Amino acid sequence: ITSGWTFGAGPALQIPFPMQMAYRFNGIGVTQNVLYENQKLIANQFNSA
């Protein structure tokens, strides 16, 4: 939760969630502004699930 995927390779480096989730979204071929324009909707769906 705190540092993403960088704590398995070497040392731990911190990062905020909206940026970490933007990276994850970019990982599957969707441009990263889509997350920034839909943050509240995405959070609501996550909590409901």
Binding site: P18, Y36, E37, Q39
Partner: peptide
């Protein structure tokens, strides 16, 4: 630039105006 959260102000350079100044 009104919908994003935590967006800051700055200046963005342009690589054509210095050339077109002359």
């Amino acid at each position: 630039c009104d919908v994003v959260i935590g967006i800051v102000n700055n200046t963005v350079y342009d690589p054509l105006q210095p050339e077109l100044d002359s």
